[PDB]
Amino acid sequence: AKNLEPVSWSSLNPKFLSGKGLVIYPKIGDKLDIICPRAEAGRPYEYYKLYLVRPEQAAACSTVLDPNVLVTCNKPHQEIRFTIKFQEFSPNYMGLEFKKYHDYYITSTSNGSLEGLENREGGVCRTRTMKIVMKVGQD
Amino acid sequence: PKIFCKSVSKDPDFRLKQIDYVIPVQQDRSICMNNPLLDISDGFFTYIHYEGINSCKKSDSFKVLLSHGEIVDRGDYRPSLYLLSSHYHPYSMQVINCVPVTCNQSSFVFCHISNNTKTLDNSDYSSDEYYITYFNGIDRPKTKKIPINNMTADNRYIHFTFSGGGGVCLGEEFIIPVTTVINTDVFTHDYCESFNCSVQTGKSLKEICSESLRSPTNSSRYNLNGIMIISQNNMTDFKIQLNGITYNKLSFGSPGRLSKTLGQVLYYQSSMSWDTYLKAGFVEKWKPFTPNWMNNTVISRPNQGNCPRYHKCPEICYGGTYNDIAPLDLGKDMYVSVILDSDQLAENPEITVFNSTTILYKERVSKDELNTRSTTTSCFLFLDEPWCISVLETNRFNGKSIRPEIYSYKIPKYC
Ligand SMILES: *[C@@H]1O[C@H](CO)[C@@H](O[C@@H]2O[C@H](CO)[C@@H](O[C@@H]3O[C@H](CO)[C@@H](O)[C@H](O)[C@@H]3O)[C@H](O)[C@H]2NC(C)=O)[C@H](O)[C@H]1NC(C)=O
Ligand SMILES: *[C@@H]1O[C@H](CO)[C@@H](O[C@@H]2O[C@H](CO)[C@@H](O)[C@H](O)[C@H]2NC(C)=O)[C@H](O)[C@H]1NC(C)=O
Ligand SMILES: *[C@H]1O[C@H](CO)[C@@H](O[C@@H]2O[C@H](CO)[C@@H](O)[C@H](O)[C@H]2NC(C)=O)[C@H](O)[C@H]1NC(C)=O
Ligand SMILES: *[C@@H]1O[C@H](CO)[C@@H](O)[C@H](O)[C@H]1NC(C)=O
Ligand SMILES: *[C@@H]1O[C@H](CO)[C@@H](O)[C@H](O)[C@H]1NC(C)=O
Ligand SMILES: *[C@H]1O[C@H](CO)[C@@H](O)[C@H](O)[C@H]1NC(C)=O
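YS: structure for the whole thing
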């Protein structure tokens, strides 16, 4: 039973490694928070749509095939957040189950700009390789 | 109205007892028993649930169980469930969705069956099949095919599914919760347009409200809730109408239910979109289908992302849980529901008794952390007292041996 370090979602975030992306090995029954930081002084807001994708879509960096969109940061002035407990039975529209020894992938194909919020192909996934992989119940 | 607590109370006595002997237990602990459904009428009950291997999606479920039973007094000083019949659906592997209704002491199950799991995206309803499966305690199940080809729709719908927690039987006609699909945007949102709220920049309010009824998978399709009315004689003659829900306060098509209570018919619709407060109300006009929506400032549900608990401001988002409700007293405008006390996570069931303004009293169902999604609740008068039965979709032991739970409890006579 542990609350993991909240993961800020921005181009500015270093926790994303160019080759690997962001990897974590969470235990079942653990909370985790994904945040969309609001526009900080002197920086432009970044607009994004975070999807949940299969591995094939994470390598290809395309969200076109099936759309499980978790959060969309379209409000710059108020920070919105996304809470994940790693049990099954999330209140997700598409349905989402977190099971032991499974790998889960979160990533965005958006521009980082208002105009490119809806891009399904490529995007920040390719460039900064902003993506999160979750191997639940691994050491 | 009889004597029970109609005002605020601390630490009440629900006489909460759990019923573990009605729902099967499975030898295999990889099987997942999910999306439980219960409709109780006239002292008889119909329970339904979806077992599927390693997954709790209803589409994946490889057999779905139907069971009929009775409410019976054991000398126990409480109502108890007696299980008369259990069967599995003939077409269960091909079942998309089901809704129970208990009528004149027999169980009916209305069903949407397809070869295509995604059929609500690609296909249309002439490509799929719609069935009534009905039985009783003594006799053998009989599953009739419903003639959709003769059906009169109040609009041009390309698809529909039975979706919800239970239907009703009024006279010689059945009324079932449905969610329908139409590919052109024919809808007017005044209520949504009424909101003065922060919005996505670069997109209008009217644009956002209109883009909100669109399906999250096929953006070319609009899901709007409705009802289906089946008039029948001995399952030979059929007259079938498909009507949509009133345009007053629309919300993205979701599972919801009908129930006869206190001489009314209450409609509930899970709030799966930007408006997260309870959507329910009694039915004041059948054509068009018109529930008189409660304005409820207190009861809500969790969801992850941009539309979490207590969020009431337009946006296009999808999710949340179905925790449905049942009426206690009209006069004090009171309801019970087993609702999840969480912001985003789906957990912490609490039996909550409330009016449109404030929560009268609550009790958490389990003291330890408990994982819960759907919650259905039905109420009835037993030995001239208000008594409730709730079925909770639960993951109690950390992802294995998933199985819904049933509880019975009594509305406190003293505050
Ligand atoms: C929703 O249900 C609540 C149930 O508590 C209702 O709130 C309560 O309303 C009653 C009167 O209808 C209030 O009683 C009053 O108590 C005060 C003392 O604080 C006294 O000065 C008055 O003469 C009266 O006896 C009661 O206080 C109030 N509860 C709270 C917490 O303020 C509410 O009216 C219901 N709303 C609807 C729309 O049904
Ligand atoms: C999205 O829904 C549209 C609209 O219903 C589907 O388009 C129709 O597809 C049928 C056969 O599948 C054709 O006969 C119609 O002519 C199409 N109509 C229109 C207006 O395009 C479409 O198949 C769905 N797409 C996805 C990806 O699910
Ligand atoms: C991100 O990509 C989108 C779409 O591919 C860009 O939007 C278009 O950009 C082209 C040229 O860059 C213009 O000709 C179009 O008129 C633009 N369309 C719209 C709707 O704006 C967008 O500019 C890109 N932005 C960034 C920051 O990469
Ligand atoms: C029992 O249900 C049937 C529908 O199968 C209906 O026609 C009949 O009227 C009902 N019985 C009573 C007493 O209403
Ligand atoms: C909610 O408010 C509207 C108008 O404000 C009203 O028509 C409706 O009856 C109200 N709901 C209830 C349960 O009274
Ligand atoms: C698919 O289902 C339809 C009815 O929905 C049926 O007519 C057809 O034979 C089925 N095909 C199979 C099971 O291969």
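YS: worth flagging: Chain B touches chain A at residues 54-57, 198, 200-202, 216-217, 272, 301-306, 315, 317-321, 340, 343-347, 369, 371-373, 393-395, 398-399, 402 (CB under 8 Å).
IM: good catch. Also The radius of gyration of chain B is 20 Å.
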